[PDB]
Amino acid sequence: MGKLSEQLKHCNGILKELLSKKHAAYAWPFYKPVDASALGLHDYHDIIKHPMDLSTVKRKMENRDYRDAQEFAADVRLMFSNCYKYNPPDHDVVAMARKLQDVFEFRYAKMPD
Ligand SMILES: CNC(=O)c1cc(C(=O)N[C@H]2[C@@H]3COC[C@@H]32)cc([C@@H](C)c2ccccc2)n1
């Protein structure tokens, strides 16, 4: 019942909410890795050096990869940053990223001390 364990339980709660039916209308583009070939995005891996998605975050949490809340938050924010770097700001996927990041940042802020 340490501080790191407690903060990682809060992180796991956030991850479960991001994957829940409540947010599915805007969360679904972030469920699995970007399939660049399938979407015709043949420049994606030249522009994005570190791809990230919620299935990879879930795998790392299940494997006890994350040692603290800051490491978890860095991967979730990397996922949003990749979206803002690659996509024009008027694409629907950017509006969806903005909405899911608002859910993330407001609950992350309620981290137990
Ligand atoms: C994480 N996902 C993405 O970054 C992404 C990018 C693009 C995409 O085509 N981006 C190309 C824009 C014009 O040329 C350069 C950027 C399409 C989609 C798909 C799944 C999609 C998402 C939401 C609503 C409809 C469709 N996701």
Structural domains in the chain, CATH included, are 1-113 (1.20.920.10)
Identify which of 25, 18, 111, 36 has the alpha carbon closest to the alpha carbon of residue 68: 111
The experimental resolution of this structure, in angstroms, equals 1.3
Please name the residue whose Cα sits nearest to atom 24 of ligand 1: 93
Which helix (H) or strand (E) covers residue 56, if one does? Answer: helix 54-62
Rg, the chain, Cα only: 15
CA 66 to CA 75: how far, in whole Å? 10
CA 58 to CA 52: how far, in whole Å? 11
Obtained via which technique? X-ray
CA of 41 to the centre of ligand 1 (A): 9
Residue 39, ligand 1, Cβ within 6 A: yes
Contact (Cβ atoms closer than 8 angstroms) between residue 4 and residue 68: yes
